[PDB]
């Protein structure tokens, strides 16, 4: 029922990496997906965004790829620093309020 | 006749956030030329930016509200903006309806809501509204449309209708103009200025009700003039004779002069201050008009 | 000579509830001589009752807040009241600190609260506070002490400290003075009046955010002058030369006279009206001073 | 535990009577008890109040008596009328915010 859902919390250790699967409902197939950072929620920093295709996108230490057959887009964060711990968001770009799901990222040394 | 209202700063109304004035200071560390859109008035009575007459309009808005529940977000309000006196809002030569917030962050607003649920009919519902600086919400108050939402497990059964929204709190405040038109530029009152070398902006300061999950420090917001001065000039429609007005800030019970300053025609006050840190002034003084002066009139330092 | 601000009522600030002025009317069915404590000023600039200068003080208060949990009640706030500028409040020649509500009912208030709980620190809490007419809470704002509460199952872990309380909504509004001193008498500004035979009070009307479980009708509250007139007189400190001022209320775009009225020295306006029902007026006119008149100058009927 | 509790809802009938038992914790033994009517809660109209003793008090069709042994004060409303319906409160008088408990009272006609 919710347009996008993911893991409420995820963890990785410093210099490691982590993966986040954002499941979404089929109607949002042809929409851009993105991985956002920080609060306030709707002014967060967009780290990566897709072009509405299955093409993997990589920007700095973050990548996003939309699997449009299973309706999941997968986010990876690499070379994790303690500075990456915080609040992130699975996102779907649309006119007005974007569908978003809060993901808390924790980092161990 | 050209004068100021005989009112102490501590008794005045703030021009960018509806609260009393608590502080009077100069701070060279802050942006010398802010582009505030509220609390902007020419000495001849011309309101600038989105400045309203009444302090009750400040950081508020009115609108026709249409509510629709969205799974994953909650109850969503689409506010079709109106001027706060009921007159139609027409996109024109300013950034937004009069009084709309001219800062950024996440704003808690409060509106009268009528429900259809049994056992209650009228209540006040608190919504969250993202102002700026940049948002994925596509706010466009310039075009007359903004979006807010409230977390809800299911529909709140709200009745669409007119509302007046007033601010409850600020979250992640940033003193930079909000998203007025989905990221596009809009007609804005120019940055405050210019200043002579060694001149700095006089700041009327209040503090905003704040949500902060970690820091208990109060959130300050400055304005160029208190709201009493805004309406004072709007009503009087003085004839302007020079570039600025020489003022003296005095304690009238003592007559002791606290400092002299220049109120430029365009609605801001400058003091000559060479210091590096903030300098706070007592708020129990009175501003006294002395004379008209040219722009290059050199003030004594403080 | 006395003059008035060139501001339309629809752009003015209401002097008893912090909100725009929406209506302008006379209504004989309502009390002819209310004992409102805010919005009361003398034409010579003398503030009466609890009237403040700034509209942001209206229906608000400031306090040193102490929080204690009461099983069966929740978080209970004991507000040791301060003047909203921080000046120590001292029981004196008025009913309460300046701006304190002068009406009755149950008021939702908002204050900045600081918590010791993990994960957050600053937030805005809504408290319920009984104003009057009579209460079992022993409210004594005249003595600088009032009580409020928010229902809760356990302590919210609030930090005592200073607060500015602002009004969120009214429940069970009654336009009668609140409990100023635990039922005892307090100094009060006298009822508004007197009027000539056939004269009735001019009312500036706003509507209050309301909690009502059964009825969707707006809650009107009237005042004798907009807050802009209050500050205008307090600042100018005019010299009074008769008992009343004859005013004309015109549409200055047309010069159309909408009615003539009398502003009595004691801070209220009168129209000559023989009807029994209510009569509303456009809110886009301007009041213009005509001349001093005696208390017996008979007005043109409307 | 809560300082005073009672029935959330009672229903009486015209010309009949009702009895409400306001149970309270022992700490409030030597406080005045009372029975209140109307909303808002803390501006309600007091109908009867004790003097912190066990002596019974009656005013019009309302009486109250404090059993300070079992820590219950009992309210009775006689010759019930349709107009008696509304919100009521068990109350304990004290400085500041009183302990109170909401009691909704419904009145209907004796069915025919
Ligand atoms: C239902 C509310 C009253 C309760 C409320 O929401 N706020 C009162 C407060 O500020 O405390 C009504 C009363 C008068 C109404 C306003 C006036 O009618 C003027 C104006 C009329 C437009 O159609 C809609 C906006 C606007 C500006 C209205 C907004 C809603 C108001 C404010
Ligand atoms: C924590 C709050 C700021 C947030 C708030 O509660 N209201 C601001 C708003 O209206 O948005 C602080 C900032 C300044 C403070 C006030 C000022 O210091 C002046 C005054 C000083 C007295 O010692 C205590 C009351 C009083 C009146 C203070 C109350 C609390 C205030 C208002
Ligand atoms: Mg969007
Ligand atoms: Mg956009
Ligand atoms: Mg902060
Ligand atoms: Mg009492
Ligand atoms: Mg109502
Ligand atoms: Mg009490």
Swiss-Prot record, chains B, C:
Answer whether the UniProt record assigns the keyword Oxidoreductase to this protein.
no
Give the record's keywords alphabetically.
Host cytoplasm, Virion
**Localization terms from the record:** Virion; Host cytoplasm
Function of the protein: Capsid protein self assembles to form an icosahedral capsid with a T=3 symmetry, about 38 nm in diameter, and consisting of 180 capsid proteins. A smaller form of capsid with a diameter of 23 nm might be capsid proteins assembled as icosahedron with T=1 symmetry. The capsid encapsulates the genomic RNA and is decorated with VP2 proteins. Mediates virion attachment to the host cell receptor CD300LF.
In this chain, the stretch annotated as P2 sub-domain covers: 50-188
Included range, full protein? 229 to 530 of 541
**Could you tell me which residues belong to the region P1 sub-domain 1?**
1-49
Keyword Heme appears in the UniProt entry: no
Q: Which domain of life is it from?
A: Viruses
Task: State where it is primarily located.
Answer: virion
Its subunit composition reads:
Homodimer. Homomultimer. Interacts with the minor capsid protein VP2. Interacts (via P2 subdomain) with host receptor CD300LF (via N-terminus); this interaction requires Mg(2+) and Ca(2+), and allows viral binding and entry into the host cell. Stochioimetry is 2:2. Bile acids interact with the P domain dimer interface and act as cofactors enhancing virus binding and infectivity. Interacts with host receptor CD300LD; this interaction allows viral binding and entry into the host cell.
GO CC entries: host cell cytoplasm; virion component
In this chain, the stretch annotated as P1 sub-domain 2 covers 189-302
Q: Where is this region: Protruding domain?
A: 1-302
Regarding domains, what does the record say?
The shell domain (S domain) contains elements essential for the formation of the icosahedron. The Protruding domain (P domain) is divided into sub-domains P1 and P2. P domain interacts in dimeric contacts that increase the stability of the capsid and form the protrusions on the virion. An hypervariable region in P2 is thought to play an important role in receptor binding and immune reactivity.
Instruction: Give the residue ranges for region: Interaction with host receptor CD300LF.
Output: 70-138
Please state which protein family the record places this protein in.
Belongs to the caliciviridae capsid protein family.
| Name of the protein in its database record | Capsid protein VP1
From Swiss-Prot, chain D:
Localisation per UniProt entry: Cell membrane
Cite the record's tissue specificity text: Expressed in myeloid cells. Present on the surface of macrophages (at protein level). Highly expressed by alveolar, splenic macrophages and bone marrow-derived dendritic cells. Expression is increased following aeroallergen challenge in macrophages, mast cells, and eosinophils.
Inducing factors: Up-regulated by interleukin-4/IL-4.
Protein modification: Phosphorylated on tyrosine.
> Ranges for the Ig-like V-type domain?
1-106
What quaternary arrangement does the UniProt entry report? Interacts with PTPN6/SHP-1 in a tyrosine phosphorylation dependent manner. Interacts with IL4R.
What is the designated name of this protein?
CMRF35-like molecule 1
The organism is Mus musculus (Mouse)
Q: What is the lineage of its organism?
A: Eukaryota, Metazoa, Chordata, Craniata, Vertebrata
Q: Which gene encodes it?
A: Cd300lf
Portion of the parent chain present: 20 to 131 of 337
